[PDB]
Design a protein around this ligand. Sequence first.
Ligand SMILES: OC[C@H]1O[C@H](O[C@@H]2[C@@H](O[C@H]3[C@@H](O)[C@H](O)[C@@H](CO)O[C@@H]3O)O[C@H](CO)[C@@H](O)[C@@H]2O)[C@@H](O)[C@@H](O)[C@@H]1O
Ligand SMILES: OC[C@H]1O[C@H](O[C@@H]2[C@@H](O[C@H]3[C@@H](O)[C@H](O)[C@@H](CO)O[C@@H]3O)O[C@H](CO)[C@@H](O)[C@@H]2O)[C@@H](O)[C@@H](O)[C@@H]1O
Ligand SMILES: OC[C@H]1O[C@H](O[C@H]2[C@@H](O)[C@H](O)[C@@H](CO)O[C@@H]2O)[C@@H](O)[C@@H](O)[C@@H]1O
Ligand code: CA
Ligand code: CA
Ligand code: CA
Ligand code: CA
Ligand code: CA
Ligand code: CA
Ligand code: CA
Ligand code: CA
Ligand code: CA
Ligand code: CA
Lengths: 144, 142, 142
Amino acid sequence: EALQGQVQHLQAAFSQYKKVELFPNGQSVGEKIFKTAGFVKPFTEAQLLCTQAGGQLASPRSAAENAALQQLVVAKNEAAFLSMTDSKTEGKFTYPTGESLVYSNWAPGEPNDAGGSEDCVEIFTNGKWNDVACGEKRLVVCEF
Amino acid sequence: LQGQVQHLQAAFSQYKKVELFPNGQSVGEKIFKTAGFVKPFTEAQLLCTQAGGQLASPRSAAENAALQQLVVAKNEAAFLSMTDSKTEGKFTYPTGESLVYSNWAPGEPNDAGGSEDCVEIFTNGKWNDVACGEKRLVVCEF
Amino acid sequence: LQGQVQHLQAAFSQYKKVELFPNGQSVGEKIFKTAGFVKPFTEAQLLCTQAGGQLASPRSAAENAALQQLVVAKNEAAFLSMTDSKTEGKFTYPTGESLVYSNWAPGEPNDAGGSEDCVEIFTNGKWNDVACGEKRLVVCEF
Ligand SMILES: OC[C@H]1O[C@H](O[C@@H]2[C@@H](O[C@H]3[C@@H](O)[C@H](O)[C@@H](CO)O[C@@H]3O)O[C@H](CO)[C@@H](O)[C@@H]2O)[C@@H](O)[C@@H](O)[C@@H]1O
Ligand SMILES: OC[C@H]1O[C@H](O[C@@H]2[C@@H](O[C@H]3[C@@H](O)[C@H](O)[C@@H](CO)O[C@@H]3O)O[C@H](CO)[C@@H](O)[C@@H]2O)[C@@H](O)[C@@H](O)[C@@H]1O
Ligand SMILES: OC[C@H]1O[C@H](O[C@H]2[C@@H](O)[C@H](O)[C@@H](CO)O[C@@H]2O)[C@@H](O)[C@@H](O)[C@@H]1O
Ligand SMILES: [Ca+2]
Ligand SMILES: [Ca+2]
Ligand SMILES: [Ca+2]
Ligand SMILES: [Ca+2]
Ligand SMILES: [Ca+2]
Ligand SMILES: [Ca+2]
Ligand SMILES: [Ca+2]
Ligand SMILES: [Ca+2]
Ligand SMILES: [Ca+2]
Ligand SMILES: [Ca+2]
C-alpha cells in the first residue's frame, strides 16, 4: 500500500547516499564495507580507532575482498594494517576471533618475522601481504 | 515488505557506523561532526546552519566527552554555539535559554579584555570564553 | 509498522545532513561531493566513475551555484564532466547530448593554443575551457 511506496522511495534514496558515503575513502565488497581514515597510525591505535568506531581493522577473507581493499591502498598510496596477528602463537596468524587464516596473499618470502619481531600484517599497493613490526605507522583501514 | 524494512535498518546501521568514522561522534540521538578545519565563529555558525544543524552544543558530561574526542583527534580547540553576546556574563544556547551544563577551565569565564563572548573547548574538555573573531575548529551537531 | 518506517526516514534524514557536511551539496535529487584534492581530468573522471557516479555536470543555474560553494569552500577551481574532445567547439555530457546550460566566463570558450577541451568552474561560478592535463579540484555528482 502507501507504506510500501514509502520504503521503495527510501531504498532508492539510501542507495544514492551509499554511493556518496564510499567516496572517496570507502569500498564495498559484498556486505562488507572498507573505510580508511586517510592517515597513518601504529597498530594499537589503528585497532583502537576501528573498534570504537563500531567495527574492526581490515580483514580480507577473499581475493575479491582483497582487491576491493587494494583500491583504497592504491588511491592513498599507503600500505595499510590488517587485523591479523601472530602474537599469541608465532608463525600462526589469526583473525580477532582466533581462527586461522582462510585466505592469504603473501608477498614472496613473507611472512618472515624479520628481526624476530614482526607480528602484524600490512597490505601493499599491489595487494600483497607482509608481516611487519606493529609499531610502524601504516594506513588505518577499518571494516564495517 | 515487512522483511525489507528489517533488511533496511540492518544496512542503515552499518552505514551509520561507516559515516561517523573518523570525524563523527554519536552520543544519544545527537551527532557531533567536525569539518577538520578552523574558522571564526560567524563562519563556523554559518557553515553549521546551512548544513542543517548548529554549532556543537554539549548539554551533558557525556556529550562534552564525545565532542572532546573530536577535538583531541584534530588537536584543535573547537567552538561551541553558546555566547553571552546579548547579556554579558550570561551564556545562552541559540534558543536563548541558559546553560544547563558547563565545564569551565579554572578562572573562566573571565571576559578577558572585555571582549570574550564565545566559548571554546580544549583537548581536556574544559571550557574557556574566547573572542569570537578567533579561528577555532568547526564542529557541528545534528 | 508504519511508525517504524517513519522512524527510519527520520534517522536517514539526519544522516543525510551529516553526510553532506562539509564536503557535500544537495540540489534537487543531485548530490555534489568533493574529494578535497586536485587531479588531472582523466584521473578525476576515473575516481568519479569507480565511485558509482560521474564528474560534476551542472544543468541549471541552481545546480551550478551549489557546485560553486564546494569550490569556494576549497578555494580551488574544479573540473566538469563536459568536453569537446569528439567535435571541437561542441561540448557534450558523458551521454553525448549538447549543453542545456552554460555559464562561460567572458571570452570563453576560446580553445587557447588549440588544446583546451575540458571545462573548469571558478569560485565565481563562471566556466572556462582549460587543458585536460591540468590538475583541478575533483568534484563528483551522484
Ligand atoms: O589567543 C591567545 C589565547 O587566547 C585564549 O586565552 C585567553 C588569554 O587572554 C590573554 C590575552 O589573549 C588577552 O588579550 C588578555 C586580556 O587582558 O589576557 C591574556 O593576556 O588567557 C586568558 C587566561 O589564561 C584566557 O582566559 C583567555 O581566554 C585561549 O583561546 C588560548 O587558547 C589562546 O592561546
Ligand atoms: O594555468 C594558467 C591558467 O590557465 C587557464 O587560463 C587559460 C589562459 O591561457 C593562457 C595560455 O595558455 C594561452 O595560450 C594564452 C593565449 O593568449 O592565454 C593565457 O596566457 O588564459 C586564457 C585567457 O585568460 C584562458 O582562456 C585559458 O583557459 C585558467 O585555468 C587560469 O585559471 C590559469 O591561471
Ligand atoms: O620499515 C621498513 C620496511 O619494513 C618492511 O619490510 C621489511 C621486512 O618486513 C621485509 O620482510 C623485508 C624483505 O622485503 O624488508 C624489510 O626488512 C616493509 O613494511 C617495507 O615497506 C618497509 O620499508
Ligand atoms: Ca611473527
Ligand atoms: Ca612474535
Ligand atoms: Ca616481513
Ligand atoms: Ca560582551
Ligand atoms: Ca562575555
Ligand atoms: Ca577567557
Ligand atoms: Ca562521509
Ligand atoms: Ca580539441
Ligand atoms: Ca576545445
Ligand atoms: Ca579557455
